[PDB]
C-alpha cells in the first residue's frame, strides 16, 4: 500500500514524506531545533480518500498501524472510550515509533475527550507517536484542540482535477478484463466534480451491467450507458407519448444542437437522444469538455446565452405556436444576464461598479436602469438564434427524420451533415 | 522567567511591578490606608500571553506558584472541584506569601463557584495571598464577582504593534543558528495581525523548511515561503494552465503594480508572481508598509481606489475584451466610495451629515443623491487609471516576457524598469 497505490493528490503526497523520513533519520530535526508535531488534521469533503493516505504512510515503512474510529466512541458506556484509550496507548507505547489514526474527530469535539487531552500531553513527540485526525468539518471542533502542543498541523484534501479522475481510473481497472476499444479519456472527461470514491462504484456497476447479458469482457457501451443511470436514471420504456408529440421534442433539441455549433464560442456535442429518463425528462444533450479553464470572457458568455434560447427559437419558425417546454431554459438564461450586469460589471451604461450584497440597497431609479439592461441584452441576443435557424432549415429536417427512428443521432453525424 | 523575557506588552509591566513591590515592604501601603486587592483579572484576545505574564511575576521574586485550569474544574465529578480548592488554599495559607493563579475563570462563572466566593472572604490580605484570574470574554462572567472585594482590578493585554513583534522574534530566535542575510525587521513588517502565539509557530515552521532539505542553516528564502503557506496555502504545480489563459494574467498583474507606483500616495511592492495558490487563486501582488499609521486623508483614499481598478483598465486597453478575473476587486472598490459619501462626510454636495444608521432611515430623494455621487467618484477614477497606462505601454511589455519565464519579478528591478 506504498504511494504509488494512491493517485489523484499530489499536495498531500509531497508535503507528507517527511514524516516518512522522520521515522528513519530523526537526528537531523534536533541539530536545529525542530518540533515535528504529535497531531496532523486532514481535513476535507467527505469520501475524498482522507483515510487511504494513513494506511498508505503505515505502510511506506514497515510500522505498526492502530485504527481507531470517533463513531465507536458514540453512545458507548460511560468510561469505556476512556478504558479503550488507555490500553490503546499502553499496547503502542510498548512498540517501536507506531502510527495510530483516529477518525472521525467532529463528533467527539466530553469525558473521554479531557482524557484524550491529557494523555496525549503525557508522552513525548521523541519516542515515535505519532496521531493523525481525519475531520469533515474544520469549524464545529473544539477549539482548545487547535492550542500549540495539540493538534496544530493541517493537511487540506481536494477533489481531483481533470487529469486525477483519469489516474485513479487507471488504479482501479487493473484486475478487470477490459475490451479493446475502451477509451478511458473520454470517460475521464464526462464524469466532473465525482470524487474518487464514485468511480470505483462507477467501475462495479459497468462490470454488473456487462455481467447481466452474459460475456467476459467489458465494451465501451457499457461504461457510457452506466454513466447516464447515475447522473438521471434507468431508461423509462413503459412510458407512452403520443406521435404527434413526440414531433415537438425532435424539433426542439435538434435546434439546440445546430444553434450550439455554429456560434464559434463553445464545446462540441456528444450525442442526441429522445428516450425519456428519470423523471419529469423528455430528452437531453450532452457536451464533452476539451481542456479545463478558470477564466471566462465576455464573448463565451454571449454564446452561452444564444445556445439556450436556441429550442424556444426552432418551435417559433417552425409550428409558430410556443410550448411549456422551454421554462428550464429560460429561468437559466436570465440569471446569466443578471450577473453580467450587476457582479461583474460588464454593461457599458451602469460601469464598473457591484450593485447588490440585505441583497439590495440602491434606489428606485437604479433599479429601473438594470431592467431596462437585462431586457436588452436577452431580445438582442434571441433576434440571432431566429437568424441561424432560417439559413439551415433544410438541414435541420434531415436530422429530425433520422433521429425519429434510431432515437439517437452521434455527433461525428451531426457535424458531417451540417457542413455539406 | 525575569521580566526580560516578555516582549511586547510595556502596559502589563510599568503597571504590574509594584506587585512585585508589595511582596517585599507591605509597609509603605499601611502607613497611609492602601488596601490592594486581592484578585486580579486579566482580560484581553486569546493567545495574547496572558499566562506567561503571572509566572514572569511569580519568578521575578522567589516565590511558590500554584497553577490550576478551571477548564479541570468543568465535567469534574461533584464535589471534587470544591475538595481541590480547599486543598489548594490549605497548601497556600501553610507557606510564606505565595501566587495562586487560576485559568479560563469565564467557564466556571456553580457549587464550585459559590463555594470560591466564600473561601476567598475568609483569608486576610495582609498574608500574602494573591489570585490572579485571566478570563477570554469579559461579558459573559459571574456579575457577582464584580463586587468590591471580589475580583476587582482588571489589566487588559493588547496585541502588539510593529515595534513588538520585533522584540518576540528576537526573543524566541537566539537559540537556533540564523544565517547572515536574514532581516528580522523585514519579516517584522509584513505580519499585521499577528499575536505573540503564531510567530513561534512561524519560526519552527521555517526550521522545518530548513530542515527538509538538510542543511544547519536558516537562509532568508526560508522564512519569507514559510509565511505565504500560513497566510494563503502550500503552492499548486499540479494545476495546469492553458498557454494562452496565463498570458491574461501576466497583464493583469502587471497593470496592477504599474499603477500603484505612479500614484503619489501608496506603499512600495514587494514582488510580483503568477504561481497558483490555494483554492480559487491565480496571481498575487504584495506591499511592505513603511510605518504605522492612525489617520486616513481624502487624497489618499483616491489614490487607493485608483490601484483596485488598473488591472481592469489594463485588459480593456490591451485586449479589448472584459473577462471574469476581476470580480472582487470591483467589490471592495465600491465599498470605500459608499464611505466617502455616507459616513465620513466628504462630499461636497450632500454636506458633512451621516445618512445611514435599520441601516437605512431616509427619504427616496435622498437615496437618488448618493447613487449620483457614487457613480461619478468610480467613474472618475476609472478614466484616469487607463490614461496612466496608455504612457507606459512600451515599458509594460518587458515587465511581461520577464514574467512569463521566471514566473517572479522583485520590485527593484520592477521601479529600475519603470525610470528608464
Ligand atoms: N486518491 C485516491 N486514489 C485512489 N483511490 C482513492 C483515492 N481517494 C479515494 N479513493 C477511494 O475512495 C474510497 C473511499 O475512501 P474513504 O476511506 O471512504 O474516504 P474518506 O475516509 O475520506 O471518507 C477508497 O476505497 C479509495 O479506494
Ligand atoms: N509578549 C510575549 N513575549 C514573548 N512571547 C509571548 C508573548 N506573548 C505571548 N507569547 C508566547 O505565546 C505563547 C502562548 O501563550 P499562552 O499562555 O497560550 O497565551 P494565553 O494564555 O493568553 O492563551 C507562549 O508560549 C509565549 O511564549
Known sequence: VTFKDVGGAEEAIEELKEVVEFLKDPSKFNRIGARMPKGILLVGPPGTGKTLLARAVAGEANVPFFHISGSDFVELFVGVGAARVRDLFAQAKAHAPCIVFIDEIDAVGEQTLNQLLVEMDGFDSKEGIIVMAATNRPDILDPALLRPGRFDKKIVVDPPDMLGRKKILEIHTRNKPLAEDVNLEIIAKRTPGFVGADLENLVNEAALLAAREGRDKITMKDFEEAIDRVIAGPARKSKLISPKEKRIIAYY????????????????????????????????????????????????????????????????????????????????????????????????????????????????????????????????????????????????????????????????????????
Open 253 to 420: 433539441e435538434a435546434g439546440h444542437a445546430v444553434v450550439s455549433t455554429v456560434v464559434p464560442n463553445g464545446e462540441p456535442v456528444h450525442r442526441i437522444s429522445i428516450i425519456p429518463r428519470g423523471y419529469k425528462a423528455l430528452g437531453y444533450t450532452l457536451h464533452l469538455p476539451e481542456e479545463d479553464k478558470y477564466l471566462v470572457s465576455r464573448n463565451e458568455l454571449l454564446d452561452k446565452l444564444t445556445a439556450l434560447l436556441g429550442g424556444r427559437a426552432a418551435e417559433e419558425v417552425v409550428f409558430g405556436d410556443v410550448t411549456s417546454g422551454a421554462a428550464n431554459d429560460i429561468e437559466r438564461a436570465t440569471e446569466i444576464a443578471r450577473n453580467m450586469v450587476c457582479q461583474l460589471g460588464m454593461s457599458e451604461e451602469l460601469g464598473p461598479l457591484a450593485w447588490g450584497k440585505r441583497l439590495r440597497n440602491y434606489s428606485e431609479e437604479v433599479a429601473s436602469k438594470i431592467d431596462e439592461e437585462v431586457k436588452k441584452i436577452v431580445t438582442n441576443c434571441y433576434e440571432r438564434a431566429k437568424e441561424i435557424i432560417r439559413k439551415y432549415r433544410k438541414q435541420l429536417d434531415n436530422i429530425v427524420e433520422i433521429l425519429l427512428e434510431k432515437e439517437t443521432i452521434e455527433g461525428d453525424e451531426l457535424r458531417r451533415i451540417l457542413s455539406e
